[PDB]
Amino acid sequence: KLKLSDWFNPFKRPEVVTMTKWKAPVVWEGTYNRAVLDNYYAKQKITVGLTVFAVGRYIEHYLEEFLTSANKHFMVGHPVIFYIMVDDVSRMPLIELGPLRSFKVFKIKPEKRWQDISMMRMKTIGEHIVAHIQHEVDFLFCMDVDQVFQDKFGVETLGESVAQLQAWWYKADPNDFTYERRKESAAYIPFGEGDFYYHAAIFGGTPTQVLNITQECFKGILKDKKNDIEAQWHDESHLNKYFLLNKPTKILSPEYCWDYHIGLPADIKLVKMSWQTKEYNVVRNNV
Numbered sequence: 001k002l003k004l005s006d007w008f009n010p011f012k013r014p015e016v017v018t019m020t021k022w023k024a025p026v027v028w029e030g031t032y033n034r035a036v037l038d039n040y041y042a043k044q045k046i047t048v049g050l051t052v053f054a055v056g057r058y059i060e061h062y063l064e065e066f067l068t069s070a071n072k073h074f075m076v077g078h079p080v081i082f083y084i085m086v087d088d089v090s091r092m093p094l095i096e097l098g099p100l101r102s103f104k105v106f107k108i109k110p111e112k113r114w115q116d117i118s119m120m121r122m123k124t125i126g127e128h129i130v131a132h133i134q135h136e137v138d139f140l141f142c143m144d145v146d147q148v149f150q151d152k153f154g155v156e157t158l159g160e161s162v163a164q165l166q167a168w169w170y171k172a173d174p175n176d177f178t179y180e181r182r183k184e185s186a187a188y189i190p191f192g193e194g195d196f197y198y199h200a201a202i203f204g205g206t207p208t209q210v211l212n213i214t215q216e217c218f219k220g221i222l223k224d225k226k227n228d229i230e231a232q233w234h235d236e237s238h239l240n241k242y243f244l245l246n247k248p249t250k251i252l253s254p255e256y257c258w259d260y261h262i263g264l265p266a267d268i269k270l271v272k273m274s275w276q277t278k279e280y281n282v283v284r285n286n287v
């Protein structure tokens, strides 16, 4: 029964892109009415899920800070379930959770290459959606562990299929985007095509939609393997091809996933999540 104008006012942010050509909102600080949405979703009694992977020394470096910050800032006022996937449960940090948060932990196999640890998430998330997440939540987010929540990340972000604008590229022209440009890859996007450059560090939707996102990306990853090719930015290259073909029903501004190495320019008004500094010499164990 919700209507876009019930909660979204693009004229509050006149100097940034707030609407796509296919009429999806781009959610910027100032445009959303969270009170209206919190009342609407509470009456439906929703639950929201969040998947996060930590394999190898990503556990010690990032998992505690990710979960402590998610407890404080993610969908406050609604029931949330954190789904944590790790290769060694004995190293999992067991922090205290607050009202309306709970969790569960799964042991997964560690792939040999960091590139395959990142890409295999697509397979694993779909398996979990079919086995249990579809029965447990109304909406799901799937996130990288190497980042920290900084302020409220709330129900204004919910939708059928949700994409994140990558912080370094949101003002750029598509022919400058780092899409996969080799026609032999399933992830190929030709010059002359593309809407935005999306970040694979945050994506979400209903369980049905996220199942389709992850299944289609993993099919592409598998096809490339049979053709002896590996996409330039791995699962992110495939996710950008997916969202070109199947346009997202909502996009989040870079305020929702910001890199402070850029600085803090005028367009970024209140940061909800920030990147961790890269530490590849320690946390990765192959080139």
Ligand SMILES: CC(=O)N[C@@H]1[C@@H](O)[C@H](O[C@@H]2O[C@H](CO)[C@H](O)[C@H](O)[C@H]2O)[C@@H](CO)O[C@H]1O
Pocket (backbone or CB within 6 Å): 166, 168, 178, 199, 200, 233, 236, 278
């Ligand atoms: C303008 C520019 O070159 N900026 C780069 C960033 O793109 C880069 O971030 C990485 O970007 C890729 C896709 O290109 C991917 O999203 C990675 O996850 C992300 O880390 C950044 C790295 O520090 O350097 C900038 O100079």
Ligand SMILES: O=c1ccn([C@@H]2O[C@H](COP(=O)(O)OP(=O)(O)O)[C@@H](O)[C@H]2O)c(=O)[nH]1
Pocket (backbone or CB within 6 Å): 052, 053, 054, 055, 056, 058, 114, 115, 117, 118, 143, 144, 145, 146, 201, 278, 283, 284
């Ligand atoms: O050795 C690995 C490599 C990847 N990841 C997971 O996959 C995500 C994607 O990798 P990464 O964040 O290193 O990619 P980047 O954002 O730096 O391109 C990480 O945040 C983790 O959740 C991990 O757990 N261990």
Ligand SMILES: [Mn+2]
Pocket (backbone or CB within 6 Å): 144, 145, 146, 201
């Ligand atoms: Mn990351």
